[PDB]
């Protein structure tokens, strides 16, 4: 399982392309380091959000890399949620940047 | 380019899990064969639709195969539009089942 648009049923939103907004946040600040679990880019609703974060690994990635993975998600057609494997050719369980619904902002 | 959720911007405006409904139509009628360009499963709006059809090849596929490809799209996380290559380890360039917005029902 490589790049995909899987996510929580809450990701089912018609209209706004939230992935684009999340990508723009990441690409606008490429200086930060993205470590596991850190929701460094997100779009908040009331008491919730669609957040981007690294998971399935103990490794960290550069802000430049995060920008690239989010651009990959937009180009793949994921409008709200999805995940991109961190390592080329590898399954997402070996490390992935995921954008998904979170029960807080 | 393999399985993906790319589609017209209109896809994102549509509400509901249209991909599931389209899959349901195809899987409920596996007897029909799908030839290039035939919009065999679709959910119409007023003057338009989200339709599924084979493209990028001269071949026709069985309804059982169309059901399989549409299930692949549902499992990939594509809520409304996307495409699945028909042939193993191939680029959608050699044949794909596409679900996309069409300006007619």
Curated annotation (Swiss-Prot), chains A, B:
Record bears the keyword Cytoplasm: no
Alphabetized UniProt keyword annotations: Disulfide bond, Secreted, Signal, Toxin
Biotechnology: The KP4 toxin expressed in transgenic plant can render them resistant to KP4-susceptible fungal pathogens such as grass smut fungi. Successful tests have been made in tobacco and wheat.
Paired cysteines (S-S): 5-78, 11-81, 27-67, 35-60, 44-105
Recorded GO MF terms: toxin activity
Subcellular location: Secreted
GO cellular component, as recorded: extracellular region
Major site of localization recorded for this protein: secreted
Protein function: This protein is lethal to sensitive cells of the same or related species. It specifically inhibits voltage-gated calcium channels. It inhibits cell growth and division by blocking calcium import.
UniProt subunit comment: Monomer.
Name the record gives this protein: KP4 killer toxin
Taxonomic lineage: Viruses, Riboviria, Orthornavirae, Duplornaviricota, Chrymotiviricetes
């Amino acid at each position: 399982l490589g790049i995909n648009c899987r996510g929580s049923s809450q990701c089912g939103l018609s209209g706004g392309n939230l992935m684009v907004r999340i990508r723009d946040q990441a690409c606008g600040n490429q200086g930060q380091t993205w470590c596991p679990g850190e929701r460094r880019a997100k779009v908040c609703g009331t008491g919730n959000s669609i957040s981007a974060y690294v998971q399935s690994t103990n490794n960290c990635i550069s802000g430049t890399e995060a920008c690239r993975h989010l651009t990959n998600l937009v180009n793949h057609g994921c409008r709200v949620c999805g995940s991109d494997p961190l390592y080329a050719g590898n399954d997402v369980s070996r490390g992935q940047l995921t954008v998904n619904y979170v029960n807080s902002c």
